[PDB]
């Protein structure tokens, strides 16, 4: 049993709820919350921003700091650095961005990062500002990731479409 309230159960082990995810994050605590995060960690907009926003600042901070260290993320990869005040955990996840040109079938290894941890609350890999179809998206991530994952859709319109497209 967890914390999780108000999500629709999709399979096994994916549910999905029209919900903040920052307001999710906060009211949860989840163990691990996922950050829809570029290759420079630049927290700037999005899902990146709103979440770093939550932090006042200090995701942004830890994360130039990771960055000088190890230089930029893999399109497609991830990083785990501190939660701040929303989670104990935030793994950073580089979804291919379409408005940069990158190739979609990167998404399908960009979920495979969630496949490291039990249980997640994540927004739609690439979706957003990102650029990718989020049909697309929430099907990738149902034929990928077999932990158990909380996905958190900021738009209702879009949340009921998911639903209802839903295979
Ligand atoms: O508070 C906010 C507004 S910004 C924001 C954007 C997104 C998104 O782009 O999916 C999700 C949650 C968000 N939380």
Do not use: W
């Amino acid at each position: 049993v967890n914390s999780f309230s108000g999500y629709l159960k999709l399979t096994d082990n994916v549910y999905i709820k029209n919900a903040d995810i920052v307001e999710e994050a906060k009211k949860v605590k989840p163990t691990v919350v996922v950050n829809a995060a570029n290759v420079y960690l630049k927290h700037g907009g999005g899902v990146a921003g709103a979440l770093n926003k939550a932090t006042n600042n200090a995701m942004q901070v830890e994360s130039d700091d990771y960055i000088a260290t190890n230089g930029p993320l893999k399109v497609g990869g991830s990083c785990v650095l501190s939660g701040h005040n929303l989670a104990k955990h935030c793994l950073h996840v580089v979804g291919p961005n379409v408005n940069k040109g990158e190739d979609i079938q990167l998404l399908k290894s960009a979920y495979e990062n969630f496949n490291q941890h039990e249980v997640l609350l994540a927004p739609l890999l690439s979706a957003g500002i990102f650029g990718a179809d989020p049909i697309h998206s929430l099907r990738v991530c149902v034929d990928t990731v077999r932990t158990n994952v909380y996905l958190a859709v900021f738009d209702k319109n879009l949340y009921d479409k998911l639903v209802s497209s839903f295979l």
